[PDB]
């Protein structure tokens, strides 16, 4: 009836800013960041237990460093606001922080570790995230645990299961995404929460992320309800 | 401009049959089967190199046995027609044929093995297929091979890679889908070609599968191209 877990991909930050004729396209990320905060607030008040925001892809790391640095700092403010003690939200990083750089990773880890584990609203921040690699790391995690418990090489070949992989993903012990909000008219996949979102409802809007409004969010929820 | 690989999901058969007034939902499946044959001709003539058709999922295998019996008969005739040597189409099967009964397994496998290996047009038929289940089996094929190369327990733990899984799936050595077409307005995912379609375009229509027309197929290529 209500999504137990909503996943949001924020497409169209640069495209949005170019439409309005902003020469300086990092501006789009600032507005997208403001919007993420408002989205989490909407989710939170709607009664949704888990929201997963897409903050950074291995794709995004192919951008020009003059703008990537701006984007990395923006992501870090966003996370430090999500983790603010006044929210009392439980926060988890989904992805590798080994790709974003030393000082920002530090700031991000510091912020997320200060949040409670028990809460009524949970947020996953997807940073340094790729879906096929999540799956690969879940398999190696699974196979190290089996080796630690004393499995032989013959017994490992058969240790892999669908439950074992779920348990060893970044989103271990969480519900799978019930609804996947995709924006800027994008009907492409990104391999975001690739394994977990195998059976999620897709919802699309034409609006670019910085232009996403509460009225669009209620449309999303109604459409989910009506399916 | 134009897809190399189009994957198709044929939902709505039963709903279509009940919409037309039939007491027997097998009219929908028989009509879906006609539509598959037509679809494949369209792809071929349009210039598409690989088509993937989703014939039977592991979900579907839980049906009433007498309805599944009759569905699998329809699927078998579908594949036998697809493999007609007039076509000179290359056919692979994608999924566990060990789930559908021995006589259908034999008939299907002998129709496909009779098709050429080198052809201008390739067709995948997905029978007894599941996305997460396909990943698990690719992993176990991977580890099985390297054990046979005399790898140690701890060597197996590290052997799993993205490129290693891409090699051991049912779609081994084939291009990933560019475009994925789903029907009955279902904006779910159902894990069809989960790994391979991580970065594919999705195209949706409200029309049940047995109502699919050449014009929708044209609308799908037009949307794909303009994206």
Swiss-Prot record, chains A, B:
Cofactor(s) for this UniProt protein: Mg(2+)
Catalytic activity: isopentenyl diphosphate + (2E)-geranyl diphosphate = (2Z,6E)-farnesyl diphosphate + diphosphate
A GO molecular-function annotation: ditrans,polycis-polyprenyl diphosphate synthase [(2E,6E)-farnesyl diphosphate specific] activity
Domain of life: Bacteria
CDD domains for this protein: Cis_IPPS
Catalytic machinery residues: 11, 60
Protein name: (2Z,6E)-farnesyl diphosphate synthase
Species of the source: Mycobacterium tuberculosis (strain CDC 1551 / Oshkosh)
């Amino acid at each position: 009836d209500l999504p137990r877990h909503i996943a949001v991909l924020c497409d169209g930050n640069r495209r949005w800013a170019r439409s309005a004729g902003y020469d300086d396209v990092s501006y789009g990320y600032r507005m997208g960041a403001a919007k993420i905060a408002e989205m989490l607030r909407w989710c939170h008040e709607a009664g949704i237990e888990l929201a997963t925001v897409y903050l950074l892809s291995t794709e995004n790391l192919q951008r020009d460093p003059d703008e990537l640095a701006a984007l990395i700092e923006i992501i870090t403010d966003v996370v430090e606001e999500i983790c603010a003690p006044a929210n009392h939200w439980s926060v988890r990083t989904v992805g590798d922080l080994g790709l974003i750089g030393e000082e920002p990773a530090r700031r991000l880890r510091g912020a997320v570790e200060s949040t409670p584990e028990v809460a009524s609203f949970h947020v996953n921040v997807a940073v340094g995230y790729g879906g096929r690699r999540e799956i690969v790391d879940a398999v190696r995690a699974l196979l190290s645990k089996e080796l630690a418990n004393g499995a032989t090489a013959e017994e490992l070949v058969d240790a892999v299961t669908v439950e074992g992989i779920s348990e060893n993903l970044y989103t271990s012990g969480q519900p799978d995404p019930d609804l996947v909000i995709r924006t800027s008219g994008e009907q492409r996949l990104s391999g975001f929460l690739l394994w977990q979102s195998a059976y999620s409802e897709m919802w699309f809007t034409e609006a670019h992320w910085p232009a996403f409004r509460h009225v669009d969010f209620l449309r999303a929820l109604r459409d989910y309800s009506a399916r």
